[model samples]
Target chain A: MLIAFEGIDGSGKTTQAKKLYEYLKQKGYFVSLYREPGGTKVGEVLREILLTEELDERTELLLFEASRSKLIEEKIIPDLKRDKVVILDRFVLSTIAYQGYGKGLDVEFIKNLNEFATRGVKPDITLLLDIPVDIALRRLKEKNRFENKEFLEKVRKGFLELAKEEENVVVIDASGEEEEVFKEILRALSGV
Target chain B: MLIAFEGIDGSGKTTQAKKLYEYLKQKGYFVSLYREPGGTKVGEVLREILLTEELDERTELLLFEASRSKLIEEKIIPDLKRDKVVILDRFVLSTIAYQGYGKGLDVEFIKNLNEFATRGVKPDITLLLDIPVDIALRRLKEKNRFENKEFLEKVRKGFLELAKEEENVVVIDASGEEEEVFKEILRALSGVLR
Candidate 1:
């Protein structure tokens, strides 16, 4: 099964995803860990371009999709086809939230391009580590200059809005302790 | 005014675009010459990624649009705003012809993106240098390994089809001598500008 963890930066989604990967492996399940914009050779290069450059909204959207296309086809799909648990730290939900909501582009366009990117290969379950923008920002010890409260708020708004619309997504209150948050994730995964 | 020259790789579009740039300059039109996936500082970096890497079709499309967006906003628009002529070696039509036709992507989507990339800044006249793919390939001394006859043929068909639909585009038969092809270009622009 394919699982995805999503939230704005510093929201502890990565921590939770790694935790889950470890948990699954401890239970004797074969698991792989991956991140968007870093899972493949092309993706690593694109990650630099996407993060370093202050790009046009359309250009940023395009770069993300390109990396997604390469990552999905070259590795993600093949790994899932072999029945390994593929845990992704970010995926389509991040695009819909960040590019669509944060950047103020058309959400419909984001969805369409995302569909094209994945080619219908969707995650079985998604864990949205929800937290207030201020709290999330405070959690980061070493933050880039690009990390601003206003941008984080817009992206946070996007994540909440998206979670309401998507069925497979379950939002967990990440403002609590890590132990509590992991419990929520385990509870959400109980049905799956 | 903005002019775009478009065709397959070995089709002399770059040479023609440069010649027109020089021609306009000699006649006192403040002209700027640029290429897609290049022009601005940002675009230069993107051009390297596009040429060096074997990206997915979707990835290349994104990179090109990104470069186009940067070049237009950073360079093309300012020159045009100052009443100078801007000549692009390739533009939106190339995307439609190559990516839309060659890669089998939706033409409507490509058109939408072209509009977005340009952000309503379109070419005043687009010169399509029409030629057979085989002959165009033969003209190149050091060919990029990416070129293929079948892909070029599909792209050529796309350009022809696009020209039929766009009033702003005029096709020039480029299979013959360079001077003859250039004469056709001059004649097309006779009704346009100097």
Candidate 2:
């Protein structure tokens, strides 16, 4: 099963992704966890450019898509072929939220471009840890890059809007504790 | 106007492209001269991977296409928007010949991928400097990488076949002297912009 975790920064996606990965591994299922933009050798170089904070929105989107392409070609497809459970920390939806909605680009265009980028590689299940922007920003005090609260709010709205349309996506309230959030993710995957 | 020069590795494309650039500039038209896989800053990095003989054919095609996409996005489109004469030493046709036909990949698939890489930006005129297999092999020997007579023969044939079907492509006899080859390039560009 292919699984993906989606949310803006500080929505506890990293912590939750690790929790699920460990849980799945403990259950005796072969699991491989990968983050977008740095999952492969080529993807590492692309990640540097994408997160630099100096590139324009279109350029960032292109670089993100390019990295995703490399990941699919080099890592994701091969793991899927081996029947491993591939868990992605982030994927095309992140690009749609950050570059498409937060940056005010045409979301539809980005979605179509990502469709081409991934070549229709859909995750079997996607867990969206939804949280209010104010609470999420309070947790992200040490801003590195792309940490503006206004932008994060826009991205939050983008993720919720996307989850509403995508059948495979499940939005869980991240307002609760980490254990509760982890349980929600487990519940969502059970239905899948 | 966008013009591309394509042929085997040492089919005098660089010489002819430089000559055409000079000729157009002398005629008082704005001209931009560049090469595929090495045009912009990022493309130069991609060119390093492409010229590395250790890389496989599939990797080579991907790197070349990646570089082409960046070059088109960063350089070609902006120059064309400004109404400059963009002269490329090589373009998608070279990838189609070297990786697809000569290297025995699917030519149609490479063609389609090339279309995607370029974002549908077709050159106004393309100059194919055609040469015989024997001559092309002799020229390839002096080049540093991927030089083999038998392989060059396949590449020469690939160029000839591509020139036959591509309407925008112009075939030039690269067997002649430098001046004669320059005259052929002039003839091809004459119809597009004088």
What is the TM-score of each predicted model, taking all chains together?
Answer: 0.94, 0.80
Q: Candidate 2, B68: how far from true, in Å? A: 3.7
Model 1 C-alpha lDDT per residue in residues A69-108, reported as the tens digit of each score: 8888888888998999999999999999998889888888
* Fnat for each predicted structure, in order: 0.68, 0.00
Instruction: Rate residue A23 of model 1 by lDDT.
Output: 99
Interface quality of candidate 1 as DockQ:
0.60
Model 2 CAPRI quality: incorrect
Across residues B100-168, which tens digit of lDDT does each residue of candidate 2 receive? 778887887677667766778999999999987677666666775346778777887888888898879
lDDT of 1 by residue, B1-194 (tens): 98989888888888888888889999999999999879987788879988888777776777788789888878888999998899999999999888899999888877877777788798889999999888888887456534788988999999999999976999999887878888899988887785
Q: What lDDT score goes with residue B140 in model 2?
A: 66
Give residue B49's lDDT in candidate 2 (0 to 100).
48
lDDT of 2 by residue, A48-116 (tens): 655653554554566677678677777788899998999999988888898888998778767766765
